[PDB]
Design a protein around this ligand. Structure first.
Ligand code: PLM
Ligand code: CL
Length: 133
């Protein structure tokens, strides 16, 4: 199952290439200007087979709850209405989002007590690092 080590409250400590990633997502300038300044808190909890990922920033909050491998409807921070699925591959929590024939991936894994989120969209690769708070 998903590592309990994922469970808890995390906070952004580093972001590489987030602007280009958002740009690839078609994000608007207003949301980009703020997304580049934002240092979100990610809270991850799990109950039975139900997992929740909550994102909090002074600018925008998001929350998704899901079961591994079961596609669900998601509304992203940038107001994308996507069909999403989260899977587990070698202890890496992998989210795929599909919309308008397009596709993006967010892979979250633990690295020396840190959580690393790699965001991919059309050759643009973003790395956001979180610390456990
Ligand atoms: C609410 C935090 C997101 C920052 C605001 C910018 C909106 C862009 C949304 C694109 C998806 C970003 C998800 C980041 C992945 C992660 O770090 O967990
Ligand atoms: Cl913030």
């Amino acid at each position: 199952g998903m590592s309990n080590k994922f469970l808890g409250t995390w906070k952004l400590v580093s972001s590489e290439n987030f602007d280009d990633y958002m740009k690839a997502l078609g994000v608007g300038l207003a949301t980009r200007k703020l997304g580049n300044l934002a240092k979100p808190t990610v809270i991850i909890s799990k109950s039975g087979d139900i997992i929740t990922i909550r994102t909090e920033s002074t600018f925008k909050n998001t929350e998704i709850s899901f079961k591994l491998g079961q596609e669900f409807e998601e509304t992203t921070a940038d107001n994308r209405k996507t069909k999403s699925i989260v899977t587990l591959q070698r202890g890496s929590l992998n989210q795929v989002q599909r919309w308008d024939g397009k596709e993006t991936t967010i892979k979250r894994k633990l690295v020396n007590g840190k959580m690393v989120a790699e965001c991919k969209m059309k050759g643009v690769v973003c790395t956001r690092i979180y610390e456990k708070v």
